[PDB]
Symmetry: D2
Subunit: 296 residues, 4 copies
């Protein structure tokens, strides 16, 4: 198996005057690289994938690929869709523009059956020869990839190598690795990075690492090296920030934090996303004071 594992960041997409701030994007990626991160995920949920155009999607993947060139950092591009023909197109597109692998979210809104999910991902995996990571996030999609479906896809499709789980369900994580220990289970929920890793998970795709790349990468690496004592210490230390970064829908809080930290110049979203309430803005600002935030 070719795989992409370790500490990985779901990159925010900075905007300036309604456009992707391309210089800022490259600079943010360089900061990730210099702080121990193993891979970056351009144009996922945290990157406002829903509201980007196809050309902007291309631009972000290209910038990620170029910034990571000559480094150990890989690019796991977001490429999911709820239409199979579109997801196949996107997987091919990502590979065309130099991605090392793709993250492909379960179809949102149209609620396919397990058989549909199996055929969806089989089509995607067959369209490219790079690694594919499934992404289960039922609170956002309205559907769940069952354990049996994930395992069948892993066993049947050479390049499907694991799943990013964002379902708040540690029982499912036990189920997955007890039955198919060969897969790469990746945490998609920051607050529980340590519990997932301590049960044999092999990485994280993190929102929090946008702000604290050094701490998330340290946690992940400690855990992978079976230094559970030190990984847990960091996971506990991070709980407050990990929680507050979801006080409103991601990436509203993380972009607010990045702005407060002076890491992006404009606190700007594309509708229907918008700035947080004053109460939540103030909570985010206060929680941040307890952490050492690396600059550029």
């Amino acid at each position: 198996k070719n795989i992409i594992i370790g500490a990985m960041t779901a990159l925010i997409t900075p905007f300036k005057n309604g456009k992707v701030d391309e210089q800022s994007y490259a600079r943010l990626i360089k900061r990730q690289i210099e702080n121990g991160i193993d891979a970056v995920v351009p144009v996922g949920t945290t990157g406002e994938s829903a509201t980007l155009t196809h050309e902007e999607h291309r631009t972000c993947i290209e910038i990620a690929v170029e910034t990571c060139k000559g480094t150990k950092v890989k690019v796991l591009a977001g490429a999911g869709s709820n239409a199979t023909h579109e997801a196949v197109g996107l997987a091919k597109f990502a590979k065309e523009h130099g991605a090392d692998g793709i993250l492909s979210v379960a179809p949102y809104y149209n609620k396919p059956t397990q058989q549909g999910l199996y055929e969806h991902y089989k089509a995607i995996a067959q369209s490219v020869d790079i690694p594919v990571l499934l992404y289960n996030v039922p609170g956002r999609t309205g559907c769940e990839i069952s354990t049996d479906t994930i395992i069948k896809l892993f066993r049947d499709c050479e390049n499907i190598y694991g799943v990013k789980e964002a379902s708040g369900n540690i029982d499912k994580c036990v189920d997955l690795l007890a039955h198919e220990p060969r897969m790469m289970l990746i945490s998609g929920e920051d607050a529980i990075n340590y519990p997932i890793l301590s049960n044999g998970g092999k990485g994280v795709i993190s929102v929090t690492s946008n702000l604290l790349p050094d701490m998330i990468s340290a946690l992940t690496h400690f855990a992978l090296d079976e230094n559970y004592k030190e990984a847990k210490k960091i996971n506990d230390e991070l709980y407050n920030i990990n929680k507050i970064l979801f006080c409103e829908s991601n990436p509203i809080p993380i972009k607010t934090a990045m702005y407060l930290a002076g890491l992006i110049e404009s606190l700007e979203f594309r509708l229907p996303l918008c700035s947080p309430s004053k109460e939540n803005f103030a909570k985010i600002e206060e929680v941040m004071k307890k952490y050492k935030i690396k600059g550029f």
Copy 2:
């Protein structure tokens, strides 16, 4: 206040496929069948119509066919036009208008979970971009978000052409809340099994999946209720419960297309991935349930 509205018995149209493409002649035939069986409006390219997997050109074709087929009749076209990206939703609204839609149905942003403030700005932008009626669509089970009663009411009061909401949330308490606080809006049932309860509380129409198969029955239920013939409306809602329930034994529109195929109303049981045929067990359950109903032909 004096909004234009689209209400009454309405159908969320399925989209038939043939050899991987939209079967345009079948689509027209199905719409004419709805018209001839008492339906007041049709919704092309919504969820039941597999909007997620149609191309932009197909979206255009389906709307154009619906508009053309309804010409020379009272039947209105309420086009599906929602997106989870506000700039896209605005473009879809203008696009539907340009192609002759009488109004638009605009689903709450799915997957990206905007806040209420974001939902308000989303729909304000859409409503400002066209001069035709806009019906909000709340279906939290699919979208991952809910347009709150406060937000719906604020939109209704602030934007002239937002005239109501299609509710698909299995929450009759919310239906009471909405009409108690803002009795001028058009509340539209988006859940077939509870069509009668929504109408009897002051709802003014339905956007139905079941009416694809049984348009005459859904039409009668709605008009009985609008005329305050509640005993007759309830009787039909009760008779329809079994089919209303089986049409969601797998995710819509898998069961309704299966039923249309079984009834001989479409030629092939064909979907676009990630949708697919139902399990053999569910296929058989649908077939058995249908035997209790008189299904209008062409």
Copy 3:
């Protein structure tokens, strides 16, 4: 079949405390006030009456006071008598009958989560133990289990004295399901905000929290609906929505007892732990909502 029934407008009675004991004089006055304001039955020692924290002797006293206060009137006593242990629930049913109850309300077993087969056997045992009417009570948010439609219908058909169900599940779909398949049963609303929708679908009464405070309004709503005056019933249901909602801002009966205290209808705002007074903020919200309503004294 021709079952004895207890239907119409009914009140889930609060239990007033004074110095840590049941205030028996207050209890009697509160019941007389319900009788004088058009209520058809009262329910002593249910959830709203803090049944969990009353002793066996207090349970006895409350039932005896309800029965005595209702003598010489048409008002019925539907006594709370459920338990999560079948042997206990049988004992409670016999006990309620012994002390003069006209029927019993028997909640689905809480906490131990029996299966449908277990629920069927539970209620079959209870119904066999007495010759008075038994009303099932489904409230999954409190019990952790749900009596399915099939189970309810099987019980109704198999056990002569089980005559229907109080539904408090926020699920109008299930109300449709129940009466579409078994129209002979008495469906009773257990959720005040949706009293009208349940009645307009053929429900035959309510067991209300709000009627503690506004008995004449709940009675009128119910009787308008039973006479098929749906416009008038809906008008009251809509007017009541604000109070109906605020009465659950914290777990019932915390808000209703607060409201009764604010209205001057009980002397002290006293609960038995683990119930306690509402937050300062919720106390203020309840007071403000009440200002819009006419409240009758004794």
Copy 4:
């Protein structure tokens, strides 16, 4: 602070209660407890949910606690008696009752059915804790009670009451477990969900109150002891091996599946429950029967 040091942790079993001809089978109960003791178990919990507390009489409650205390006497095994109620006055009475009958501590479930507020829950447990001088373990199980003890409430009770020493969590919410131990690392977090015993322990949890251990006490006790010694590799191996049985033991409401397994294993003579509990469906019975055949089940 003596009390702060008095805890009951390690591998613990939520005991089933065997019936024979509608009565508690006292000989069988003693025998089953001895089997737990001889297979590495650190404490037993008589008359909890798994023991069908809801349907036992007060006299049967006393009998079960007495048998547990006597059987554990002279061993290091502790008795953590079920003593919760949704009425505070009753819960206080039950705590005193458990103490007077020799229990080492009590397990006290969050009030079911009546849905108290967090302030009510705090007052409920403060009353209970002040009534006895033995350890109290809170028990959060929202799917059964209809309420949840919030992290803030749990931490406040731990900080305010000397003898409230931790919480048994059965909420399938590992985030909450992180939250609890990140903010109050001195408490004893106890797993109440067998399938995730290892994840809870590896995050600093200090024991389990197990249903599965009724059937496989040796495997649950080995897992727990490995984890407490930071041999995570070996603890995880057992947790993984156990997943199939841990899952099937909840195919219907506990203790329906565990009693079915005990019966099929010959560890109790009859598959008998008190209503409203009853035997499982034919489908689930068969699933339980087949899953068991992959495990080694110790006899007496």
